[PDB]
Amino acid sequence: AGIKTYLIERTPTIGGRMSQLDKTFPTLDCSQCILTPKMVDVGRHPNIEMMTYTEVEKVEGYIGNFDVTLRKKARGVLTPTEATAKGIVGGGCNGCGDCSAVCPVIKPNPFEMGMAPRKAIYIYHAQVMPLIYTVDFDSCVKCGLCVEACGDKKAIDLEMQDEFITVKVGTAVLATGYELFPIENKREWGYKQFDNVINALEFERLICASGPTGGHLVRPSDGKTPMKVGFVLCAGSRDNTGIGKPYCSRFCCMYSLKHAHQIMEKIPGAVAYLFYMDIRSFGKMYEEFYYRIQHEGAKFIRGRVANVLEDKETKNLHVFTEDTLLGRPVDVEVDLLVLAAAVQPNEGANELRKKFGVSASQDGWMLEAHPKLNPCGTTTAGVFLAGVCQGPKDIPDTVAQAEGAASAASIPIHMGEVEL
Amino acid sequence: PRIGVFVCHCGTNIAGSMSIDDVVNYAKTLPYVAVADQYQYMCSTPGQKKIDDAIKEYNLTGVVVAACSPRLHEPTFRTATKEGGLNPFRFEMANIREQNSWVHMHGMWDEATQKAKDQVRMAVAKAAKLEDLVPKSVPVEKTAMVVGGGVAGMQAALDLASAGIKTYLIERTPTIGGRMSQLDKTFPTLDCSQCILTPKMVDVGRHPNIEMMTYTEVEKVEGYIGNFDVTLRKKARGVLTPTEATAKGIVGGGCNGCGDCSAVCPVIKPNPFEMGMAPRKAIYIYHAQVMPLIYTVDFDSCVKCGLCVEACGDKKAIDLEMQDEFITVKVGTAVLATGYELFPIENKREWGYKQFDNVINALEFERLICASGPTGGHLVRPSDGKTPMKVGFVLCAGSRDNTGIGKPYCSRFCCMYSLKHAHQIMEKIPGAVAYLFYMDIRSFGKMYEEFYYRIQHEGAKFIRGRVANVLEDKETKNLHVFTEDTLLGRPVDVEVDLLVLAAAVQPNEGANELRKKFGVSASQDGWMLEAHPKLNPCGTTTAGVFLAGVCQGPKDIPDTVAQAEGAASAASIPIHMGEVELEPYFAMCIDELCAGCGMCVNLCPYSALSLGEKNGRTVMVVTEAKCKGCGTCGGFCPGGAIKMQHFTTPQIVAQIDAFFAG
Amino acid sequence: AAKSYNIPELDKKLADRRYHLSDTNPEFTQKILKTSRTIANMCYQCGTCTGSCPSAPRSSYRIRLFMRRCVLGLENEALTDPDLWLCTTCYSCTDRCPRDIAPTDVIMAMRNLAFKRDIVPKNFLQTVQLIYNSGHGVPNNDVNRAARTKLGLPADPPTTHSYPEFVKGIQKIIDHYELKENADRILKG
Amino acid sequence: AAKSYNIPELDKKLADRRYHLSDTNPEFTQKILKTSRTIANMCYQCGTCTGSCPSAPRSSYRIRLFMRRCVLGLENEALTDPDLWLCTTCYSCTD
Amino acid sequence: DWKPQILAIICNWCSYAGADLAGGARIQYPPTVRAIRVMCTGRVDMLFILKAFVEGADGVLVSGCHFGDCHYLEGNYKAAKRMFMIKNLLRNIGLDDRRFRMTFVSASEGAKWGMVMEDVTNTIKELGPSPIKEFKK
Amino acid sequence: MHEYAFFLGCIAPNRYPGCEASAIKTSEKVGIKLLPLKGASCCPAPGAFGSIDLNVWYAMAARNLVLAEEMKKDIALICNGCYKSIWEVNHILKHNDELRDNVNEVLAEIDMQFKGTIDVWHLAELYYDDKVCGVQKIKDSVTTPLSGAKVAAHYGCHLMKPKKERHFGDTENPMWFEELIGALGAEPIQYRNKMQCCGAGGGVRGYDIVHALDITNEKLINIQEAGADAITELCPFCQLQFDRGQIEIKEKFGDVYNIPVLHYNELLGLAQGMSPQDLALDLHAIDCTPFLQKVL
């Protein structure tokens, strides 16, 4: 639309959760393939000031001028532009990888939900948009091998500190997303205590071809291929006991169907069992997706899982519930159990929405101006909501909400005046 | 020519199916190839840098990338080719992943390698003959059109107008508002629908940047992203607004909405707003809160008695001889917001919709329960006018149905509105009980699960069983609902006073005609199709047309409004710029080869071709703006006098020849 | 349900009621699909079939339960159920199923498998005997011959009651499938 | 299930298995709610209780079925069931 | 010693999308067909097909959108008429007309694209090497 | 005069011969000619024989079909169960190739082949069609009014259901059979759940007589409540159930209805002037004499 824009991301790369997704319901497209184009557009757009690995320290002002102070965290590595500004003609970071080839520290990768190693100097994945190789200063030992590997490019500055910048903006759009609810609190499903119980983002990384495995789903306990996989739907959701969330997370029925399809097509002869309590395929082509999954042969057992026991020797998981339609208790022994955990507002989202003056819903998500006729704007003028931060949604609904918020934020900028 | 061949591994997605080294050596030995080289991720910044360095070092004329599909990465590598001193259109891809690797993974490796060599050879042959194109930029008219005056149309119109673009709002009916104007209360917050919408209807009616054209249709559309020449049919309303009356010369005014005309009209007909439950005269408004309060005349039912004009008197707003006027409007973009109608549930004979008096559907129930409806807001039985005490709600009525009668999809909001109606009856009739015969309660949205909890707490009975059939008691007119309580495990026979069917929704009447006028395709489900189902749910494949609301698929008022504002933003993108670049695939006539036969002229669906005078000779003339690059004309012309810009006959024939080269 | 005790009444009382994955017979499911010629694995347990059945309100017969057993492969639960022979094949369930399933055709296939494992009521075997002997499930008798004569019709209808040479062909058809050789064996007991 | 025949074995064999609205006892439901001091009318039949019961795998006892009977008011179905005394009150369902 | 040489000319908006979808879904088929990718099948001139057959295509396949689903409103009706006439010409010049066919593959029919690939390969294998390659000399 | 092979299954010739006699006479009075089928047998009764073995069901129904195939004629039926067997096996074997093959190599042991060349019709379907005798032609042929009689129709299940496999239209509330009874001059009445099974199908009549009789008794109660004076039907199974089962209900339960059960062909004969003796109404368990007093 022509407005200069700042894109603040706390992490060293843009993309979000959809960059972690492997295939997307209900069209089964590769997530990175459909998103990499848009990441390139964002990275190349002259009207976008992409500021990754940066946070919002403080906000003051109003609809007219928001004096937003940003914290530029010490990335430790210089982009070519910043290197030329500092005087290094040879450039900054070209993403060769020699630094991480020689770094001796090895730490878990948060992008891979911890399943995979990454050095102290690292990128999340090979398709990160700013391919600039952050340094993790909480874990770097300043051995200096990385700078020797980088050589004449001189992109690594191990003494970099948090720089602060103050930016004046007219409007602001909040798009903080979500995290998975901590399902280790539900002790009856032995999430942290049994090896072969995982959650749906770890399953999505295990099934992706770019993940810690070669795209091969294997059992965490011994590295063998599963042949029976259970999907516990509603894990921590529609739950009024005070531990889980009392709401529906919207997409967990759909992504569990996707994962059942993926296992049944990737491991020949494997069977998927879905322990469900209201299959919710409400969107466009969702019911047809549900029909197709049942046709390919996923077993749908209408019963909320009661508890899970681990076999002491085979590490197999005994899932106990009742088949409510059959009318009998069941004991399904699976090689791998996947929990479709609830989602909750991201870490620090409440801090950021208090900085911007936004309130919260009953559910804990950011509140909108009018729940029916204004789902993007907030009560504080000049701030708009977009994405899962306002409530869980699929990528189509998230994008519609994001463009709606962009339109609402453009309304006062195009006019150039606002009346208080 | 000097061509560079760059073969991506796609991170073993291609190197795990063929021999990339062998493909590269073959490319090196190919004719015209200056440099052949490989990289792990050619779509990444080091890959573009590799392309650019190769261009600069080897003085490359063109670039061939043996990688994924063009439909995925033409823009990326065209921009990479531009940055480097070439034209974007000196570039050609060889799809060796989605059409070689992923389909020849298993047990066949040298065969996939030979296929890759063939594809690279054909790509090099085309690229050695590509030459420079510059995309056409066309001006964009600074107006916009919104077809549909429901919540999605009104939101899109208000958004565009407040962004500053002049907007036309076309509504086939005499009033804006849509279905939400018929709704009585709204889930999950229980607000009054008209109370929340009337503010926005007033905004639309008062906005200076919105040309609200009610009771008007779209006869025909021609043009493209730049200028859409849209012809509108202004149906004979029969009554003049004050502005039109002053224009025609009546100083005293036009219609002020007094109501004397309908007070004296003797014809009485059903009201479509009230789903037929209520009478309305031949001259009428739907409800008292219609935005243009202008009192249409229904000419199919008027008897021209002339009492209305005598009642109107000196205002002289009624013109009984008015005819359909036609207007042509030029617009830059268009937003389609046609909404929906209820699926005809009388086809499902086991639920006696038309044959039993006390079986209604959910919009008739919403009008019966509204305080502005045919009743005084009192739900009464249609058979005898008595108050019901047991009400059944048949959920999924005609939905998730693969028998060919109903719809195979979920209508999204029918579980939620049935919960709302159960609450409304249990709170409005003391002691009444609501029974919901359900098969997957779907309360997925924000506060929806809490709404479901609250309804169960107030005491609605939830019986998990799809209704099998309905029998009517011959004397009391009560309805015997037969199904199985699947959780209880027994058949049931619940006798209710009123049965409400939560019927499926389908695209509105005439929506397919309108989307064919605008060039939009349809989905598997029958709704209008979007450009990309994940990352572009508003735009369509035809440029300059955008979707908003239930017309793209069923949705609640929150999702509909988000979609409408998204569509308004997408329609504003090209208007604010004022330029838009077309893809240079146009047909170009070579005049000193054209013989003027004129036979190609009728092969263009877009009428881009015509016969004109150039240098005395009658030759063919291409309106390069109207051409879309299909190639039908250029595939027809026997003399080869039509050139297709990036898919020329020499290029395609070079590809064929290279395929058969050994 | 702790284990097998080999005391028959206690085994009956403490039978394991809990479904295990060892209980599924995919071969049984595939045989049912082939014989019934219907998409039975696509049931989503809406209950319309049971809600329409005329046998359900007066018995323990549940066609939806039989569909679930078919889907889960519960052979020896479906076949031995005495409420497998209470279906009148009225086809109301098939008329109304939203998934285009023929539950009554699934019932018919189940009945065929039950016969092949020798569970079958005796009226069926007696009808087999009658059709083998005369080609007619309801054969003629002397009083009806007299009634037909008094009417004016021939004492026997134009069927295999009056053309006994086609009975031999009917018998060869039945013998090819061994229906008589199984019916008489089962009746002998 | 056509009507009452007054032949006890045939009445037992052809007992009406079909739930009617005449079968509901709201007074029974209210007494249960008062005495139990629990929100029993809010069950949505997930089956977790039966899936956790130790009496269910060896009998016809179904606590979820008893909850459904409570919700629907099926007095004389809940009370006369001999599997009302197979609950060990282990509280796993409540847990 | 002999491998069939089959050439496909597939439109961009339904047949290329369908082939891409088949690849994405990992539907395997034999590697005998190589495609050209024009915008519409209306672009396909008769001389393209005849040039392929005279260079020695053992088979030629032209794949496009279903009737009523052309991206450019009616460009595959023109292609259908052209290919009917091409079928007639090949029959009357004495070449086997089943070496040529035109399939209508939508954007979502990756499975049908795989089946088309298999069937075209099988038919050409039954037919054998084209006679033009030896009739030229 | 259209000509059809007359299949004539087991119950009409051997228990209710007046049904077949009136069929031939009334069909000849209207423009239809019913030709005997040469050596036809039991259509393998769909319940009691299909429940046992579907392959032998197919083989016997196909043999019955190829008899009329050699006759080169179209089958005409008067039984809903026989319609199920004959018509449905004809339809299945006209489209399923492997089943054609299997049935043909079974039938080749008796020098006999199925090719699928004929069509199967129910006699009431022919009476309703307009090309063949229509409702107006039935009204024309009627000579005794049969006025002042309330008559309840039982459609049965195997003629009309499933509607995805037949072509008779709505199964929830059809009125076509009510038009044929209205043509005769008798007023057809509507009763609760008129589309309910009589209970005799599928072999239940034999397996569990009490269950089948309870299903029948539900219907009889509804019909008496409506006020019927007879029950017309288009099936000898359903007639046998409604006729014998009234006696078995009177003995096993304590319910008395005494409602005559007549095939539509018997009512058509009564309307066209055939005598009760010529219709053999003395062969029914339930006396028809009150109904005869009313309509005569």
Ligand SMILES: Cc1cc2nc3c(=O)[nH]c(=O)nc-3n(C[C@H](O)[C@H](O)[C@H](O)COP(=O)(O)OP(=O)(O)OC[C@H]3O[C@@H](n4cnc5c(N)ncnc54)[C@H](O)[C@@H]3O)c2cc1C
């Ligand atoms: C296992 C799983 C599978 C799924 N599968 C599908 C699927 O197949 N199809 C589908 O359509 N949807 C799917 N979804 C849902 C989908 O992931 C969401 O719809 C979508 O990611 C929403 O994106 P978002 O931008 O709103 O949030 P996010 O993707 O979470 O993005 C939020 C971004 O903001 C950043 N951020 C957070 N807080 C701050 C802060 N204070 N300052 C700066 N930056 C911040 C985060 O680092 C992140 O980059 C799935 C979800 C899960 C959990």
Ligand SMILES: Cc1cc2nc3c(=O)[nH]c(=O)nc-3n(C[C@H](O)[C@H](O)[C@H](O)COP(=O)(O)OP(=O)(O)OC[C@H]3O[C@@H](n4cnc5c(N)ncnc54)[C@H](O)[C@@H]3O)c2cc1C
């Ligand atoms: C019984 C019922 C209850 C509901 N309750 C709720 C609720 O409580 N809460 C909620 O959020 N949602 C509810 N919904 C859903 C809600 O109605 C929709 O989300 C919403 O109305 C979508 O609006 P729309 O503008 O897209 O379509 P519509 O409201 O249908 O508007 C479309 C408009 O376009 C016009 N139009 C159509 N074709 C043409 C044409 N060719 N040319 C010109 N104009 C045309 C129509 O006349 C109409 O004015 C309910 C739906 C139903 C059926």
Ligand code: SF4
């Ligand atoms: S070695 Fe230097 S240039 Fe290369 S990736 Fe590491 S920091 Fe970047």
Ligand code: SF4
């Ligand atoms: S300084 Fe040492 S520990 Fe730190 S990133 Fe460089 S090599 Fe790794």
Ligand code: SF4
């Ligand atoms: S989306 Fe499905 S799995 Fe997720 S909480 Fe809602 S009902 Fe449960």
Ligand code: SF4
């Ligand atoms: S250009 Fe295509 S093939 Fe190459 S790495 Fe990128 S996505 Fe993979």
Ligand code: SF4
């Ligand atoms: S009488 Fe005239 S001014 Fe008044 S409402 Fe009618 S048309 Fe309008």
Ligand code: SF4
């Ligand atoms: S002319 Fe007569 S019928 Fe027509 S609107 Fe006026 S009063 Fe009514």
Ligand code: SF4
């Ligand atoms: S929204 Fe609910 S009632 Fe409507 S079709 Fe979907 S599941 Fe059925």
Ligand code: SF4
């Ligand atoms: S371009 Fe070709 S077809 Fe068109 S007028 Fe000229 S010669 Fe004729």
Ligand code: SF4
């Ligand atoms: S390519 Fe030819 S036929 Fe197609 S739109 Fe352009 S001018 Fe018209």
Ligand code: SF4
């Ligand atoms: S009606 Fe069909 S879908 Fe529903 S339970 Fe019966 S067989 Fe399953």
Ligand code: SF4
């Ligand atoms: S066919 Fe059998 S299962 Fe189906 S409704 Fe009739 S009796 Fe019940």
Ligand code: SF4
């Ligand atoms: S009582 Fe049992 S069935 Fe009901 S919600 Fe609680 S655990 Fe689920």
Ligand code: SF4
């Ligand atoms: S208390 Fe224990 S025994 Fe009783 S119902 Fe609950 S889980 Fe079962």
Ligand code: FES
């Ligand atoms: S777009 Fe494919 S045939 Fe025209």
